[PDB]
Design a protein around this ligand. Structure first.
Ligand SMILES: *[B]([O])([O])[C][N]C(=O)/C(=N\OC([C])([C])C([O])=O)C1=[C]SC([N])=N1
Length: 268
């Protein structure tokens, strides 16, 4: 890689942003060198479901000191279900274990699972407190699902910046924010994500393994965060936020894939 290639990538990101109505917020970090490719890196974006990575990390951190927490069963009823709860709607009554809730919220973006885990931790402010503990001064979780997805212009609730989220994803999945076993579990869950095949995954080479978490809001908006694990070189962190409002899902996913492709080109 080189600075010149990273500057070219940033120009290509600006050109990409001109292809849709809205803003692109992008950071990629090459962990072999620390090199960064950035576009609107310090602007706030609604994080939508990508916060579920921070949420699950906070649960895992608590589980490091409570060996039974991940097996604890949390009951809930049909009245507790919010919109888009494909896994939790199957287990109304006796409910699900904390580990199962984490897997559901990470791999299917299950919203009720997220709310149950937020309540487990003591409320949304506990997720913000966890972010502070790992060095993220920017992240703020103010609301629960599904209200946190409103994305009102100028509203800083339930936002972060691409730079702050990339730093947190790096520390969580590649670095020292969590203990060994918990870092590994977070990677395992995110490697098994079911919702992101058309986003960051679609922009990187086939042999790369991707651990990602998607987000989706109103009006065909979307985002994706994660780490790619190339087969014989160092991991690369990807954070792609947008305020894109699209006519269809394919257009939105193509922008996110393209942004990842631009950074992969610069770093290989
Ligand atoms: B998260 O951002 O993944 C939670 N997403 C949602 O609640 C919404 N949609 O869910 C679908 C489209 C199934 C998804 O792919 O995540 C959503 C749609 S509009 C809105 N405000 N939230």
């Amino acid at each position: 890689g080189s600075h010149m290639r990273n500057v070219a990538a940033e120009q290509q990101l600006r050109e990409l942003e001109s292809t849709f109505d809205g803003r692109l917020g992008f950071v990629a970090l090459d962990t072999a060198t620390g090199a960064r490719i950035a576009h609107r890196a310090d602007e706030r974006f609604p994080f939508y479901s990508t916060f579920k990575t921070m949420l699950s990390a906070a649960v895992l951190a608590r589980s490091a000191g409570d060996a039974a927490l991940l097996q604890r069963r949390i009951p809930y009823a049909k009245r507790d279900l919010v919109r888009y709860s494909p896994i939790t709607e199957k287990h109304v009554g006796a409910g699900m274990t904390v580990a199962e809730l984490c897997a559901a919220t990470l791999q299917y973006s299950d919203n009720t699972a997220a709310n149950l885990l937020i309540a487990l931790l003591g409320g949304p402010q506990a997720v913000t407190a966890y972010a502070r503990s790992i060095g993220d001064a920017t992240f703020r979780l103010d609301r629960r699902e599904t209200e946190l997805n409103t994305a009102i212009p100028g509203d800083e609730r339930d936002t972060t910046t691409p730079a702050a989220m990339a730093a947190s994803v790096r520390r969580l999945l590649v670095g020292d924010a969590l203990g060994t076993a918990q870092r590994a579990q977070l990677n395992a869950w995110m490697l098994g994500n079911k919702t992101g095949d058309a986003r960051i995954r679609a922009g990187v080479p086939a042999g790369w393994r991707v651990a990602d978490k998607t987000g989706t809001g109103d009006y065909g908006t979307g985002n994706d965060i994660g780490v790619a694990y190339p087969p014989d070189r160092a991991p690369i962190v990807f954070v792609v936020y947008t305020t894109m409002r699209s006519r269809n899902a394919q257009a939105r996913d193509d922008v996110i894939a393209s942004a990842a492709r631009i950074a992969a080109r610069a770093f290989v």
